From a paper:
Heat shock protein 90 (HSP90) is an ATPase-dependent chaperone and the molecular chaperone functions as a dimer. The conserved HSP90 structure consists of three domains: an N-terminal (N) domain that contains the co-chaperone binding motif and an ATP and drug binding site that binds the natural compounds geldanamycin and radicicol; a middle (M) domain that is responsible for binding to co-chaperone and client proteins; and a C-terminal (C) domain that contains a dimerization motif, a second drug-binding site, and a conserved MEEVD pentapeptide at the C-terminus, which is recognized by the co-chaperone HSP70/HSP90 organizing protein (Hop).
The N-terminal truncated HSP90 (MC-HSP90, residues 293–732) containing the middle segment and carboxy-terminal domain was crystallized in three different forms, C2221, P21 and R32. For the C2221 and P21 crystals, obtained under similar conditions, the protein solution was pre-incubated with cis-dichloro(ethylenediamine)platinum(II) (cis-DEP) and cisplatin, respectively, before crystallization setup. The refined models of MC-HSP90 in the two different space groups of C2221 and P21 contain nine independent polypeptide chains in total. The other crystals, the C2221 and R32 crystals of MC-HSP90 and the P6322 crystal of MC-HSP90-Ct have fewer than six molecules in an asymmetric unit, but they also contain this kind of hexameric assembly in the crystals, suggesting that the hexamer is not just a result of stabilization by favourable crystal lattice contacts. In the absence of the N-terminal ATPase domain, co-chaperone and client proteins, MC-HSP90 structure contains several disordered regions, which correspond to four functional loops: an amphipathic loop (residues 347–360), a middle segment catalytic loop (residues 395–406), an extended loop (residues 616–630) and the C-terminal tail (residues 698–732). To confirm the presence of disordered loops and C-terminal tail in the crystal, the C2221 crystal was harvested and dissolved for in-gel trypsin digestion and MALDI-MS analysis. In this experiment, the N and C-terminal tail segments and the residues comprising the amphipathic loop, as well as the extended loop, can all be identified in the MASS spectra.
Numbering used by the authors:
A (entry chain B), E (entry chain B): 294 to 349, 359 to 395, 405 to 615, 630 to 699
B (entry chain A): 294 to 349, 359 to 395, 405 to 615, 630 to 697
C (entry chain C), D (entry chain C): 294 to 349, 360 to 395, 406 to 614, 630 to 697
The structure:
């Protein structure tokens, strides 16, 4: 009799929808249904629904077609709490059999979501509602992390205005390419045009643009996809596919600017840990990166710390400032220029001036020069 | 028999303290105590305590020595909800009886606070903990707003590392000074060294440093004190005491840069409503102020805006800029300059930029100029 | 797609009702519906229903997503019979009050349209007048709009209940005050001694005969200028001639001797006695000060003034009969008899109803031997 | 080591109190303490305290481990002023009742010892008599032990309140019933018409002058055999001579004519009138049936019988004065006057207190002209 | 000022005890105190107490010496909920920093418990109150399972009436001994005298006697100690240190009784999965064991299934019944004897007869023979 005891092949979409509206006092029908039964260990039937709109535990529990409760937070994990429906156990009596029901429900929900994905138009419709939940699942459900990660969709430097899957990112990977590059910030345009992605983008190396704050917490646990390790492009020591000749070309620029690097680190005092030669810049003269362990600019923005300033070996500014500096180490104008570079990189790398008026003053002095005063 | 029924001369702080710790399960004793009896139309008895530490309403109510309840909506308003103690009514056979109690408690609490504000040592302990509540009450409680305002203490451009009262501010007001000037920002240093206070500081017109967030909510309601209106130093049209001579000197500068203001506004088009000759700057070449009607940069940052660019007529950058722009109002370089100045002033005024990359690129183009 | 976001002029009463019943689990449909929207400030839509029967809340939506029902501060407590939904566009403490003020605005709007159609205002008012009155008591900003919904029986009005607007159309040129009385029965108050001279003068009196009425008029102080006055309390202003103003003077001194001598021999029982201008056929009545509790106030659980009738035979006799030779158990027997009888007639309880009953037994014992 | 497992004879009142105060957050110590143990069936210990002031529960331990305080069924609701601890040895629905019955046994034991010491029973009884009475009402198994704790004012007892045991020592040989009255004041009930003949006969009457009393006596039906009877209700048994039994017959027929003719002209107001054996000096009173609500029952919010006094002058006159020629506005005026006066004297309210007050105004108007 | 902010070296035991009684309205003082502070990541001080008696979350939370709450079930795991005390954070503002506080509290509680253990008289006093909690911890706190397992104490066939640690069990292990043997049942005597332990005990191989029901749930997750894997002696395929000669002696008894094993399995029909030759019996003629995965006799007793009947190669009864049976396979008296053996093993191995009267009848027939009737 009750709808969850009928054979799925029999029940129609109108029928389900009606049951759903009736179960949830929702004004519209479900977005997706998953309706199944498990055998042997425990016997149970389940009818699960995905709402059209994300809510701002509530599976109804039955035994032998008799209502028990629905406070049962043990049936599904926090992150799938948007799921709604009934579980009809063919008899439960410790109390942990509930774990076995939970695992099945997650199995099937993940199965449902995969199927939604294979419908490539209108996975949009689920994903724009529930990707926060996916991502939250990746953080805290280590057992299903891999499956959950196949459901993610992102903007990438290759994707234009489409969100693409990690699987697709992988099939486009280059040859010596060993790593999945990502960036986290507030906007697609803000990251696309960032100093950190200039060189990857010039060489056709694809960057995932993670542009929602949950992403910060998500990448914390998403270490890898298809055995390729995910690397942040705003952290120290960006590693990128090396040629037998670039690795030599690098160490050659490294010891070239080793000197200027040492004088720069000297005056920048305790504002920066290291001053290294960059491997991620083309047009931008320098940038600020943060240590492998630590807080990013995006994270300090959410907080409402170990910096490295990377210089660009091939930028005229840096290049000439290597002349000036090795000519006169303690020179008062190199000093204020070094800070001004630093201060500029700070801003354009997502950070926030310790004192913005001293920075203002620094600009003022410079433009006073510009206009030919002093 | 119970302590609150005893006569306040016969009770010692050691005894009051012991009661308080019993009452509230604290590990330390109270900071202050008010034990009073209202006699007359409705007689009742109250023993009130201020804690030494602000907690993360909570008054026990008794009728004729018999406990009734403690979760009592509107025995005191929310802003005084830190007070703890008991009220023992001598007669009771939701109502309007509670209004009488509520007014009495609120009088005596404000009484206690004024008293505490002698003994300067101890007011520091109280205010350090409960400044927020005093302010929260100025916003909500109009019947008491003036008493609440005399309890306020602030860091000012005159005061050093001590915080002073509004009364004291007033004792130092100049001649022809009609306004109390305040700035609101994140830190004392930030505000004390903001472009907005340069000239007030030079003339020795005191400025109040408002550096807590509640202050933004608070001055929304503290309109004036002791007949003198409070004015923000970051909003348009800063009025100053100005001698007959100086006014004539300010008017010359207005028309001398009447032209530069015009061309600057044209270039800055959509980003600025008005550019004006400043009266508030000395060392800085310009700053950004917000329309009187609109809302600030301190406020924009607390969410977790009509602008004026004021320009310093006595500044080398500005006096040089006049010359260059009047020589060619279309010089792409004058333009690049103006936008630089605008961006830098925007940063200096607590605003965040539209696109910190383009601003950075500007800087770079420049620092590549003065180098080859 | 949901009903509250559909255009109100498309939606029919069977649909509203289907929705109402479905929202509330009522078996009968709603009694009134108000479906409006708001713009500018804060855009939102509301669908509010008035149930047919008094009880003893509101579903809040943001962008068509359910948030909560409980929401303690959406309508004020006196309008909590109202069921419905509010759907907000832009809502991400201080702004709920913006919603609360609009919802109340449109409820009162609804109630005013409801009042226009008499052949059915009855159905509303019988059920929720208590709420209106509780409204006047607790809500100051709308006290005025709320009192125009009040309906009362009056001296002028027989079996119907009329409005204060209505009362006012019937006021007389000189009349500055709206006169009311509080009691337990329509009959009881209409035949009371207080109304007599007012009625004789053609000045309408409102019969307030719910207990709630006693609590409501604490705060309802005026209407269209005019101030309200109980007829059971000391000091009653009454439009007076230059002629009658001269004549009310006569009595307050002719009977002043009696007024000094009557309270003299009634102390502990009643405190001060004056000439009464509210009396025609009755010889005395107790009025109840201004601070002091009234006979109907005290009932739902002190300060009595005896007012005697100048032009009454009983009073005129008992004047000169007392004035010369101020004693004998008989002059005392009647003065006590006037107090007690006046005290029951004004709706009070004698401490001992034997001291009164035995007195009737003395009066009846020598009515025949 | 904890106090409730220590031997009661070691532990001092300062310790009990220190414990009590610490248990309850009272500022003053306990008023009574009962510390007992139980064996056999189910071993357990209890420490129970009686607070000095009435409120407006019990910590349960098993093997010295805390379980819960709330425990809804440890003492019955009427004994919920009692604070304390119960510590059980063997407790691993049906057995809590075994504890509940023992705790009540020892509470009543405590209250009985409390009553032995008069120079302090006052302190208990003033505070918790309401609870005792609520006990009689709800707890049948202990109704008897509970009524021996009841203390009342009586006709016989002046300014003191006595027990029913005490009442019984003063009963007369022939007396089968315990007579009580319910009213609002001691004075009010002692001077009431109902008590007159009982008092004259030397039969003690209990003055029950709390409202709660009205509710309590619903279920308190007897004591030491003797049954209780209200003096404000129809049919009052009274020890009678062979002589007086013959004489009460005279009146019930002499006045039967009047009894037929009096109810004839009082219908809607009162239903049936008989000769009264509760009256001496008063001429009439209303009694209130057996089903029907009484004047004091109706007060905390119908079926009245007029009982007239045979040996009264007013009644004897009004007999033959009516019998021959049964009319004139005067015979009616007095019969109505007897009803109303009898109705206020019995503690009722007239529908309109003007119909009565005007009648006094007719009687007084020709008491002098 | 407050006791948890004072230096432990300063506060006395009387002082702590008093604070404790006052914090818990407990009539007696604490059994143990642990009082510490953590630095850097978050700063906080904590004062934790162990009660004398097991209760039938309640750490009080403070920030900058200001009370916050105590419902905070995130501060310690279910199984340590008997712990009572205060946590004073030097400022907490997501909300998951709580995890970092939790880990510290568990670290320290486990540290406390270890110290209690090193006091070898009067660890009794903690352990008899809280071993259920230890064991519950082993089930569900996989990260600390190893440390938690060092706290366990058991009766063993070697220990007499002392409870001993797994570490001690290990230092007594034999030479080819690779495994920690245990048995679960209701009583020390019931397990000591069980058929399953006869041979281990004859050879000096030590058996842990697990005699509380939580043990059943505990061994479910306690796979190993010091790299030695725990094996149940009531399960199929007891493996025991093999000599170059016993392994041969076994396979020799195996094929000897291979025949009788097949006829026995034949009549015992679907009551038993296998009938094998035993390797755990000396005096007892046979016994019932249950499959590696499955339910034990003890577990079916808690439920208010795959059996193997092992025969004893050296028991006269079995030995002669191998003669009788290979002489007459389908003989009616061998049949009823085979069941009677089975039925007896069922009872003495913790199980419960499907039909006890048919068993009774079986005995009756036998004793009717005994008395010489039939």
């Amino acid at each position: 009799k009750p709808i969850w005891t009928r054979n799925p092949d029999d029940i129609t979409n109108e029928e389900y929808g009606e049951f759903y509206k009736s179960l949830t006092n929702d004004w519209e029908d479900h977005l997706a249904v998953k309706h199944f039964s498990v055998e042997g260990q425990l016997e149970f039937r389940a009818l699960l629904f995905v709402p059209r709109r994300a809510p701002f535990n509530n599976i109804k529990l039955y035994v032998r077609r008799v209502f028990i409760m629905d406070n049962c937070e043990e049936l599904i994990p926090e992150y799938l709490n948007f799921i709604r429906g009934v579980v009809d156990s063919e008899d439960l009596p410790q109390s942990k059999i509930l774990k076995v029901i939970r695992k099945n429900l997650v199995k099937k929900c993940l199965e449902l979501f995969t199927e939604l994905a294979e419908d490539k138009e209108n996975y949009k419709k689920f994903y724009e509602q529930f990707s926060k939940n996916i991502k939250l699942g990746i953080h805290e459900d280590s057992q299903n992390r891999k499956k959950l990660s196949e459901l993610l969709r992102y903007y990438t430097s290759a994707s234009g205005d489409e969100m693409v899957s990690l699987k697709d990112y992988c099939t486009r990977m280059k040859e010596n390419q060993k790593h999945i590059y990502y960036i986290t910030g507030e906007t697609k345009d803000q990251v696309a045009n960032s100093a950190f992605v200039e060189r990857l983008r010039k060489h056709g190396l694809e960057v995932i643009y993670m542009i929602e704050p949950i992403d910060e917490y998500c990448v914390q646990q998403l270490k890898e996809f298809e055995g390729k390790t995910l690397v942040s492009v705003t952290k120290e020591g960006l590693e990128l596919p090396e040629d037998e000749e670039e690795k030599k070309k690098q160490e050659e620029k490294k010891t070239k600017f080793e000197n200027l690097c040492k004088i720069m680190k000297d005056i920048l005092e305790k504002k920066v840990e290291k001053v290294v030669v960059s491997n991620r810049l083309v047009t931008s003269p320098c940038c600020i990166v943060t240590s492998t362990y630590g807080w990013t600019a995006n994270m300090e923005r959410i907080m409402k710390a170990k910096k490295h300033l990377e210089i660009n070996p091939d930028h005229s500014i840096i290049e000439t400032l290597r002349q000036k500096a090795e000519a006169d180490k303690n020179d008062k104008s190199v000093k204020d220029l070094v800070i001004l570079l630093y201060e500029t990189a700070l801003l354009s790398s997502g950070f926030s001036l310790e004192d913005p008026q001293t920075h203002a003053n620094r600009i003022y002095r410079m433009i006073k020069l510009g206009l030919g005063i002093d």
